[PDB]
Amino acid sequence: YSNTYQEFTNIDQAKAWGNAQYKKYGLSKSEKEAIVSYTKSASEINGKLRQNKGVINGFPSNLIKQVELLDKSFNKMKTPENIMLFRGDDPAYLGTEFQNTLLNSNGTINKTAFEKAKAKFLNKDRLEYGYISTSLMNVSQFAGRPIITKFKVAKGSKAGYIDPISAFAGQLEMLLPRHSTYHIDDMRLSSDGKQIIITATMMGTAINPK
């Protein structure tokens, strides 16, 4: 009785579709500028959100301003379809105990590592303190990366196609709000054993200004 999530297979129409959503956002200059700032320093911002468990009161004032603009910009940015979104991650994504432990010399993932990954994460909620940068398709940015997550994001969910707002956004980037929880439904290896494939249902964000 599973739901159907669309996967984009046609880059040209993936951009048309994203552009088409974007043209309806009606974002302010300030919200566009905050998105641009996020794309320029995303690893730093998400790193601070993580270290501080989503509490932003201690961040520098200009950053607080940008984060609250970004959080509120999602009021304007929803997906009108059930869509699958992709990202690729490095071993530390699973925990620091996995950082230097996951792969083999051939470049296949370690079965015993992978087995540890599941007991820890399979069939469990995960809260993400940072924003979640994803792509509308499985773009080349990844493919090197040993972990691919496919998020199932339901109609009406907060999700912003930011690729046209910032030249430093990922190809077909779809940004998800920070402080989101998702449920990991499935973890399996790729066919050529180079990748752990994670399928998760996005449950949504705790940040709802309004």
142 marked ligand binding residue: yes
Angle at 132 between CA 140 and CA 204, to 5 degrees: 130
> 15-54: which residues touch ligand VO4 (CB under 6 A)?
28-31
Distance CA 151, CA 184 (A): 9
Residue type, 75: N
Among all residues, which ones are annotated catalytic? 87, 133, 173
Least CB distance from residue 33 to ligand VO4, whole Å? 8
Distance CA 112, CA 7 (A): 31
- Closer to ligand VO4 by Cβ: residue 13 or 30: 30
Check binding of 75 to ligand VO4 (CB under 6 A): no
Compute how many residues bind ligand VO4; rule: CB under 6 A.
Answer: 6
DSSP state letters, 128-165: ESS-EEEESS--TTSSSSSEEEEEEE-TT-B-EE-TTT
- Closer to ligand VO4 by Cβ: residue 10 or 28: 28
167 marked ligand binding residue: no
12 marked ligand binding residue: no
Least CB distance from residue 60 to ligand VO4, whole Å? 4
107 marked ligand binding residue: no
144 marked ligand binding residue: yes
Check binding of 61 to ligand VO4 (CB under 6 A): yes
* Side-chain-side CA neighbours of residue 151 (13 Å): 26
Distance CA 71, CA 40 (A): 17
- Closer to ligand VO4 by Cβ: residue 39 or 157: 39
Check binding of 57 to ligand VO4 (CB under 6 A): no
Q: List the one residue from 2, 53, 60, 167 that touches ligand VO4 (CB under 6 A).
A: 60
Distances (CA, A) of 202 to 83, 84, 154, 179: 11, 10, 8, 12
Interface residues with ligand VO4 (CB under 6 A) are: 28-31, 60-61
